[PDB]
Design a binder for this molecule. Structure first.
Ligand SMILES: O/N=C1\CCc2cc(-c3cn(C4CCNCC4)nc3-c3ccncc3)ccc21
Length: 264
């Protein structure tokens, strides 16, 4: 039953990039897989911990909108194996190759991303790094949320970081609520086709002002056939005070409703 994979079996190919605590490859194990390797030379107790936490969370997931965990390896190196998604991150489509989705499709991506977040929270999993880089479009029609290195039961993202998280105001800024905020910023990416704060060229200036509440995403920029309900949901998700943010059940219902009204 265990998910350990005997050394020798996974075949590592292309280095394709990064993921929390490690390097991502395309690989082969009973077909195409993504492999993240957390390693070289011998693991830190740091990395050992990261790897054990992440495998632990992954094996609690089974759902079409969560990237499928397939197994792990310790013996050449710490390695996590998942299904391979052909396509790319939502980030790559939106901000690198400028794929232009239709509103109907954008709303669907939002709805499935909602659907996954709702699954995770129902199982008490806080992703803590939702952002469009960790949303993979498999076969271009299905959202898989990936990368659980930072999830709970020399690095920083921040464009998706809620103000509470930015100003590390205690031990625990993280919550379903901070996840909901990150989702708010990916609704912003879907609807505006843009990263937030694009007219401020200073990272520090952004970190500060979102921290103090001076800055917040310019919701004017939402393309013109974004439904009102969607602009309105985005603003709920993006509330500076976390207690005013909706949880994912609500978020989900709101998106499924505005979709039923939408093909008209
Ligand atoms: O735990 N996190 C994991 C485990 C497996 C895993 C795979 C990826 C992953 C990262 N990229 C990026 C990397 C930076 N440059 C652009 C491509 N593309 C994928 C990918 C994932 C699944 N199918 C196809 C591709 C990320 C995280 C994790």
């Amino acid at each position: 039953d265990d998910w350990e994979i005997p050394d020798g079996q996974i075949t590592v190919g292309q280095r394709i990039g990064s993921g929390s605590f490690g390097t991502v490859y395309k690989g082969k194990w009973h077909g195409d897989v993504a492999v993240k390797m957390l390693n070289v030379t011998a693991p830190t107790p740091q990395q050992l911990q990261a790897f054990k936490n992440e495998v632990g969370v992954l094996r609690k997931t089974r759902h079409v909108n969560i990237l499928l965990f397939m197994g792990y390896s310790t013996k050449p190196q710490l390695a996590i194996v998942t299904q391979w998604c052909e396509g790319s991150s939502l980030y790559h489509h939106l901000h690198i190759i400028e794929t232009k989705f239709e509103m109907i499709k954008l709303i669907d991506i939002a709805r499935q991303t909602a659907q996954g977040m709702d699954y995770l929270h129902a199982k008490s999993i806080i992703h803590r790094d939702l952002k469009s880089n960790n949303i993979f479009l498999h076969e271009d029609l299905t959202v898989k949320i990936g990368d659980f290195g930072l999830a709970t039961v020399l690095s920083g993202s921040i464009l998706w970081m809620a103000p509470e998280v930015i100003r590390m105001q205690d031990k625990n800024p993280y919550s379903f609520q901070s996840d909901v905020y990150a989702f708010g910023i990916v609704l912003y990416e879907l609807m505006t086709g843009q990263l937030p704060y694009s007219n401020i060229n200073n990272r520090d200036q952004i970190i500060f002002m979102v921290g103090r509440g001076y800055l917040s995403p310019d919701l004017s920029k939402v393309r013109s056939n974004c439904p009102k309900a969607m602009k309105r949901l985005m603003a709920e998700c993006l509330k500076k005070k976390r207690d005013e943010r909706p949880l994912f059940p609500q978020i989900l219902a709101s998106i499924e409703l505005l979709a039923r009204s939408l093909p008209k």
